């Protein structure tokens, strides 16, 4: 219920553009922690971008977990049928969808939730045993393949509660059902700016963490005024080292922001 501040670091593998090597990610996390040892860190893993090997992700997660950071991971569910096209009532069960790569057939909603989603979570826990804190379910909750019933949503939220995981959401479509099940939620930046506000902050304060892009004192002031109790603050930058420059500047500016707000509320 007391207000808490978190520093959000986006971590993706090197590509022609930005990203960061495992060594750069570890070096950045060490400097960020040294700059604000009293502020939590949330690592947004896997978010023209490169990809990590599994061993690289494991080394990154191990280093961040040892520092005490929380990890948000992209589950990256396969929701399109095993490329082999389908010819029967499976066609009636596989919703045809056109993406940037043409026609695809969604995996039947029953087979995904029953066997494929729990297996993906089991493979996830086997690779990062007890080291993940939030999971991203874009293709499941906000994809063009599935419209989950309220019963199916609670079944999913039960699958990640069993693994001790929260969820990072890109939309408010299932928000109220998310808090009702008592799962931790990480609200992405530009979710409302892309309607739900105060009521849940007063209802479930310790369940909601809102990620905001820092601009000025108004960023922290508006979040506190709206009732947010956990504010994950993302700074500018693209690669991990470029984010480090913005974070180190932002830690100094945010200290002045909180100090000025404290004198006004005194």
Author numbering: 3 to 49, 66 to 212, 221 to 292
Please quote the paper that reports this structure.
Here, we present a strategy for the de novo design of a simplified scaffold of an endo-α-N-acetylgalactosaminidase active site, a glycoside hydrolase from the GH101 enzyme family. Using a combination of trRosetta hallucination, iterative cycles of deep-learning-based structure prediction, and ProteinMPNN sequence design, we designed proteins with 290 amino acids incorporating the active site while reducing the molecular weight by over 100 kDa compared to the initial endo-α-N-acetylgalactosaminidase. Of 11 tested designs, six were expressed as soluble monomers, displaying similar or increased thermostabilities compared to the natural enzyme. Despite lacking detectable enzymatic activity, the experimentally determined crystal structures of a representative design closely matched the design with a root-mean-square deviation of 1.0 Å, with most catalytically important side chains within 2.0 Å.
dEngBF4 crystallized in two different space groups, P212121 (form 1) and P61 (form 2), and the crystal structures of the protein were determined using the molecular replacement method described in Materials and Methods. Form 1 has two protein molecules, 1A and 1B, in the asymmetric unit, whereas for form 2 one protein molecule is present in the asymmetric unit, resulting in three separate structures. All three structures aligned with an RMSD of 1.0 Å or less, revealing a common (β/α)8-barrel organization with an overall fold similar to the hallucinated model. For molecule 1A, more residues were observed in the electron density than in the two other molecules (see above), with the lacking electron density mostly corresponding to residues present within loop regions. Specifically, loop regions ranging from Gly50-Gly65 and Glu210-Val220 were poorly defined or lacked electron density (insert I and II), correlating with regions displaying increased dynamics in the molecular dynamics simulations and low pLDDT confidence score. The dEngBF4 crystal structure (form 1, molecule A) was aligned to the backbone structure of the designed model, revealing a Cα RMSD of 1.0 Å across 191 residues with respect to the OmegaFold model. Notably, the native EngBF active site, which displayed an incomplete (β/α)8-barrel core, was successfully recapitulated in the design, now featuring a fully formed (β/α)8-barrel structure. The specifically restrained catalytic residues exhibited a Cα RMSD of 1.2 Å across 31 atoms relative to the OmegaFold model and 2.0 Å over 34 atoms relative to the EngBF enzyme crystal structure (inserts). Notably, His53 and Asp57 were excluded from this analysis due to their location within a loop region for which electron density was lacking (insert I). Additionally, key catalytic residues, Glu188 and Asp156, corresponding to the catalytic acid/base and nucleophile, respectively, were found to be positioned within 3.4 Å, compared to the 4.2 Å separation observed in EngBF.
